[PDB]
Amino acid sequence: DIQMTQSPSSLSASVGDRVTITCRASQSISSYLNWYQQKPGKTPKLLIYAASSLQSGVPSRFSGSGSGTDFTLTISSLQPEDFATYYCQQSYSNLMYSFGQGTKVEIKRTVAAPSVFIFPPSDEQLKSGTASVVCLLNNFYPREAKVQWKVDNALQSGNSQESVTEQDSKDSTYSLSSTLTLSKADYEKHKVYACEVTHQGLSSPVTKSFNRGEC
């Protein structure tokens, strides 16, 4: 009966920056709003309760303000340990507590173009009737990137899946792996397999390709 809307889905900032995250309620919740921090795979951690009260042991660079429907969480000077996802949560409802959908705070660094590598399917995999073609985008920033598979210059769609690493704790980059999956029969019907990569660090897209059967 009370919907929470968190405003920036994602925030890019550097160590030392001031960060403000916003949380709006569809109904008045007085000051009954709490903030939690969660890192990937880890358990959530209480930071602020009752809109502005700092949980014991939380550093004083965290603060919160607001009453009614509009609330903010502020980090006055980001530290490396502060990059995480943040959730607000209203405790005013007597029907259901609810959470905002989260704001990810990630590390802003200089733009870095990906290094691109393409891998043909192995002979061993082909023997079993399927071909997996893999394209690697290594150590780039920011995380937004586009992979376009082409098979004899036909754009492929719906037959690939991709995965992205969490931001690297040392150089703050991301890496991405994309797999194109074809039947052996389809794979042996075509010649040129291409991975075309678009990223804001590249003035124009980079394509890595191979010809089936060529060393």
Place this chain on the structure above:
Amino acid sequence: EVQLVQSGAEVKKPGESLKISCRGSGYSFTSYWIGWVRQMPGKGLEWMGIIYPADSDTRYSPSFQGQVTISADKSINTAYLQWSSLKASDTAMYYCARLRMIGFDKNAPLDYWGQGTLVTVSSASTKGPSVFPLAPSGTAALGCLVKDYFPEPVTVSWNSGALTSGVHTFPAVLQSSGLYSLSSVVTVPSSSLGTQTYICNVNHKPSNTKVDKKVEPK
């Protein structure tokens, strides 16, 4: 100080029942409400319900009423969350958490959290991975494709742990077949390809699978 510790990862089939647990210590277990929270893959937090362990007074979120049962055994400081008939859509991480509330409201944040229980619900069955090479060809890249396994997790190392710099082991993807697949890559000096051996070590405990795969230029 205060601690909530939850039971381990679960892998089930649709239609099966399941009960997971949350053990409290370091405080009066019957003096605080315990809440349960759901986090499906890649999504945020949802509140499911609460129980007061002294008398097993419960409140459920409307979305979860009649879909789960929350209970407690106060004699062993443990709360439980149960399904009678699981669905694949119940696949999620489940947290228990202590409500720091005296009386009714006055505040009520969740101040201590369990470490979470992973629940996987799928019609898929246990299967070990096939490991295929990502053969190389300044800086070259190589790796291993760990394909068609169930359930999570798989662990990958390189040269038995001696090679760590430049390794990226990617999150697995769930294929439409119901089986997982992941890749693990490493970048190395092009000069090393002729002389340095590169072997990925893949372990999948649910299937009792151990694989060592040497990867080299073709």
